[model samples]
Target chain A: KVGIYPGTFDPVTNGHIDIIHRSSELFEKLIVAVAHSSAKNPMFSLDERLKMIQLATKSFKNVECVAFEGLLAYLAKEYHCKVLVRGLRVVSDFEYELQMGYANKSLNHELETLYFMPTLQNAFISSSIVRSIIAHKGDASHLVPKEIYPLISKA
Target chain B: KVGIYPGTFDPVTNGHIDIIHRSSELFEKLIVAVAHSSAKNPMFSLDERLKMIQLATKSFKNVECVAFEGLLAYLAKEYHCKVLVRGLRVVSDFEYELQMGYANKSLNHELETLYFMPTLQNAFISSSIVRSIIAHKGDASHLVPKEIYPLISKA
Candidate 1:
């Protein structure tokens, strides 16, 4: 089955790459969908975010990095995907993520959302947290994927 | 140093007790503050939550269970606490908790917030999830502390 892992990715972190790699193993093909999250006022531009994900996930043969402009459920339908992979961080934002998953399911009955928890080492890291640390000139190399480590730090 | 851990404790879960135990080890004295979470419209009453936390944490002599009606930062100050211990579940929440930490910092300059990551086994579970399972009559014996298992499942 095909699965789509969608996120803003504002310079992908180790946690995102961990989930992406796990999704790659589960599905025949994993599509990493980067969105133009103007609402989140993303730290990195959409092009930069997509490029970072592409670089971070390039080595995985089954993983494909792409960009989407609009509704995620519709995007999943367009790709004919049966699964949507999500990262679950019960400590992160519990209610909102569940709400989004239910809303997406209602929007696309054929779509199923699966959650993967990050390994302990990567659990506390997030793109937003990485951005904040980088902005403050703190080292975030350990928290992010090495492919885009220079890109994130040099920004 | 004194530290306080605050939560609704609407039938406290294993994750909650885990953090509580960790915090107890850190502080000379640890205050478990049960909030009167009227806005969240908790499944359990404040009294019930207080009892659950008290029972769950009864064996720990350094951990004291108490109730708070107003601002958490102010409550911490009233108890002469210098640190506020928070559970970090990057798998759970990222933005809102950080925002709350900063807001609390601004409100009470003397108080500092410290976050503890739960063990991987407890990372994916939350009190809300436990409540949902109980509501649907699903077994959650493993998700909660044994002391309050009856309170959570019977609610």
Candidate 2:
């Protein structure tokens, strides 16, 4: 089955790549859906974020990178995907993730929600945290893929 | 190295069990450290939580369930553990976990921290969520272990 993993990916971190890598294995096609809007004041432009995600996920043959705006349910429907993929890192995230899953299900009852947990090594990494570390000229090479380290380092 | 996983474990759910299971494999010994004090008014008493944790983790011969109060750094030091085990389920947890890790590092420089990500299937489960569901007479058989189902259901 095709699954859509949607996120702002505001400068995708290794954590995002972990989810992409694992989810791709489970579905015939795993769309790494990057949201075009920087609603969270993304440091990287939508185009840059998309390219970084593409570069990071190039090894996965089943993965495809796409940009979307507006409701994720609509995007999932447009792609004819039945599953929405998300990553869970800690307990605080459960309520919100479940709420979003319920809301998306309300939009399309047939849509199933699947959550992927990052491996222990990369579980603590996040885009916003990487951005903050980079903003202060801190090294984030450990938290991001080598393909996108240059972009993050430049900023 | 030995690792100590500290939590209130108001009632250990499948999520905590997943961490214990994974961390136990990585360390020589993993202490499933449950905090005695519930300043936030946990539904289950400390003794009840301890009994439930022991019952739930009976399968892991290397895992020992114990109770603690005060600083986790002290507990880890007393146990001769160099590492602290934590579970991350979302980005929101990163900041808090990092802060705690840093604070613990300052208190005891020898203590390192390791974060574990729950398996995707169990990542969304938490003791608080289990308690809430049980309070409303909801079946959480899927979110918690069969061994502790009786305690949660009876409560």
Candidate 3:
């Protein structure tokens, strides 16, 4: 009943929160697994990202957040979960995910991926957009979850 | 406690099913309102669309399907609902919905829209994509819900 949602979450945005919120409802437990390293030149450190995820998801009792250092397939196995939860967003869903699915299948034969669509209000919001907005001193309370808004704003 | 999901579901796809399934969980009742006419030149008529919606939602006792002729705001008022449910797919979210929210607000002050994001696996599927596939005699089974696949195939 546990589903693992793995992401860099440099600073988790509302888009991720919607996925986390929705995914929590579908499973007995949802593990918001933050990738320790991201190829995107992460603005927040791994520790910061994990803290932000926990704050953003504070209201969800069944939802828990953690930081990971290696293969996501390994993370799922370690958490004793079979499902990987993901959000369907833009171009990446079509190109990268198709390949990710195959690679993960090879690494963990029992693993299955479940995808969630973002609420349209959050469709255009991403961590990059949040970071960019923060960089410009723009108000990002609308894009990032209010629970972690102060941390993002200070960053 | 009730929400109205208004759309011209010419042939309901899994993307719509995800929204229906998720919304059904969040509310006491879900009214799947199929638009009688679409500006995009609908492939399936109103009756066909309603039938498909009913078939697709057979397992959901709290979710009911109906056909609406005019303003969706009026439809919600008739149904005694103050909430509007919509799907967030791609380009349409950023453009059409902004105008739609304003129009709906002007028509009914109490109405509030709730948008659901499509699961990444079903994000690429739409009624138009299903129609185009059926036109070329290609398999649309993957794009549509299994309950109404037989009817879609025959059409």
Which model scores highest in lDDT? 1
DockQ of each: 0.32, 0.29, 0.03
DockQ of 3: 0.03
Per-candidate total of colliding backbone pairs: 11, 7, 2
* lDDT of residue A54 for candidate 3: 81
User: Candidate 2's error at A110, in angstroms?
Assistant: 29
- RMSD to native for every prediction? 21.4, 22.8, 25.6
- Chain A TM-score relative to the true structure, per candidate: 0.58, 0.58, 0.57
Give candidate 3's TM-score.
0.39
Q: Each candidate's iRMS in angstroms?
A: 5.4, 4.8, 22.8
Which window of 10 residues has the lowest lDDT sum in candidate 2 chain A? Answer: A108-117
Which portions of model 3 show Cα errors greater than 4 Å?
A: A1-5, A12-30, A38-45, A55-63, A70-155, B1-5, B11-31, B38-45, B55-63, B70-155
Chain B of candidate 1 achieves a TM-score of: 0.58
Candidate 1, superposed: residue stretches over 4 Å from native: A1-155, B92-155
Colliding pairs, model 2: A88-B89, A89-B88, A89-B89, A89-B90, A90-B88, A90-B89, A90-B90
> Judged by DockQ, which candidate is best?
1
Winning candidate number (TM-score): 3
- Looking at model 3, residue A99 earns an lDDT score of 41
Query: What are the per-residue Cα lDDT tens digits for candidate 2 across B34-136?
Result: 8976554789988899999999999999999998776889888898988888876545557866777877767554344555656867777888778768767
Docking class of 2: acceptable
- The sequence of per-residue lDDT tens digits that candidate 3 reaches over residues A1-155 is 67777777754555566677766775789888888776656656788667767876888999988888855555555776655665544443353245435544453222222323445555666444555676798977665433335544674
lDDT tens readout by residue for model 1, B74-148: 888788877887776554346765776777767654344455666778976898788768867999999989999
